[PDB]
Design a protein around this ligand. Structure first.
Ligand SMILES: [Au+]
Ligand SMILES: [Au+]
Ligand SMILES: [Au+]
Lengths: 70, 120, 128, 63
DNA sequence: CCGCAACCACAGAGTTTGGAAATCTT
DNA sequence: GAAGATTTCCAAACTCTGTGGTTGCG
């Protein structure tokens, strides 16, 4: 369709859209903000499980020895 | 998601909504499963027919088998399937030779898809 | 398993198959975006690659055909106004051979499901 | 509004913007991938711990 | 008559893409 | 002091999903 930039519906629509775009980008910001946080959150979880795996392993080994060496 | 038997005893595929809107992205991603062995990379494509519609317009109906499963990225159905009528889709696994699995009265494609009962 | 216990019985009794066992109107289903012209060009062009995409207008059953593993071949000249095709297949665990012709101008033809006995016996044995 | 300087000054900036955006865009995608990676490593170490658990559990029972 | 199951239009919010216009950095 | 990079303001073109207006058929 062909419309006039002076009309009303054009402005009403053109404004409301602008509002939705303000909300739309203002939302995307938080997703990126969260994605980055999740990176730290995960990096921490991984190091924490690395120590859990590393530890739980040494325990299983040392535990076996006493079982086979006795 | 939930898988069901195809008309071919060697493949299982996702269950599709009984009814669904044209060009509207599926509720769940469509998957084709291979019980026998299928080397990865093996292409798969779906097509759907109907006594009233013989070849419906599909979107992204081509996928690659990986670890015995065909995962489709937004398979969309475009042509309608006719009132009260459903499509029958044809999964085609491209190996030597090609294997074919049909899945009769699989999904119904209308232009409105399921709607709340019009309140009049 | 690539196939069921016994293809025979099924193909012969199974409504779905029988109905297709006997020649029926089939049409090309390639690109429908481009006017008739491009299509035939495409189909024929695809015939060059040994890839065609057809479906039994009657039932509505859609099928993608591949021509290389009676025999798996494609003829030109038997009748110069159309094309004769044969495609190997395993429709629902029943090794079959799809045969039929299409008028290269109409992009319409008629084919039949021809349950390959050699393949069916072969698959049955190789399968366990 | 039509000055010779505008024809340039304006389109001049645009070039810097397009670039800025394209840069920041890649920075995000890369961050996403980074999440996927860490997610993978997380899911492995996770399953790996549940493993060594039952593996040491069953070993505690044999005692 | 009414309600169902289809079609068609088409609001109206959400997204995406990209050129302005202010601001900030270096 | 200001060119280039970063951020904010807008516009226009699409994509998504829902609500109505209408129909043949029970
Ligand atoms: Au549609
Ligand atoms: Au040809
Ligand atoms: Au024939």
């Amino acid at each position: 369709k062909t419309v006039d930039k002076h009309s009303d519906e054009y402005k009403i629509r053109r404004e409301r859209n602008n509002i939705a775009v303000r909300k739309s980008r203002d939302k995307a910001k938080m997703r990126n903000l969260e994605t980055q946080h999740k990176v730290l959150e995960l990096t921490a979880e991984n190091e924490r499980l690395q120590k859990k795996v590393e530890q739980l392993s040494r325990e299983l080994s040392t535990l076996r020895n006493l079982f086979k060496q006795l | 998601g939930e898988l069901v038997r195809t008309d071919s005893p060697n493949f299982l595929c996702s269950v599709l909504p009984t009814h669904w809107r044209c060009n509207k992205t599926l509720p769940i991603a469509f998957k084709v499963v291979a019980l026998g062995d299928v080397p990865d990379g093996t292409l798969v494509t779906v097509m759907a027919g109907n006594d009233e519609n013989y070849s419906a317009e599909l979107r992204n109906a081509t996928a690659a088998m990986k670890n015995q499963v065909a995962r489709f990225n937004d398979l969309r159905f475009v042509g309608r399937s006719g009132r009260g009528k459903s499509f029958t889709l044809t999964i085609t696994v491209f190996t030597n030779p090609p294997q074919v699995a049909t899945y009769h009265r699989a999904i119904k494609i209308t232009v409105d898809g399921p709607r709340e009962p019009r309140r009049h | 398993p690539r196939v069921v216990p016994d293809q025979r019985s099924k193909f012969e009794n199974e409504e779905f198959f029988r109905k297709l066992s006997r020649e029926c109107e089939i049409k090309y289903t390639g690109f429908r975006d481009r006017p008739h012209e491009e299509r035939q060009t495409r189909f024929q062009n695809a015939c060059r690659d040994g890839r065609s995409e057809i479906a039994f207008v009657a039932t509505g059953t859609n099928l993608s055909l591949q021509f290389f593993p009676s025999r798996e071949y494609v003829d030109l000249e038997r009748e110069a106004g159309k094309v004769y095709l044969k495609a190997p297949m395993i429709l629902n665990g029943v090794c079959v051979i799809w045969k039929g012709w299409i008028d290269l101008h109409r992009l319409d033809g008629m084919g039949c499901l021809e349950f390959d006995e050699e393949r069916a016996q072969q698959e049955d044995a190789l399968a366990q």
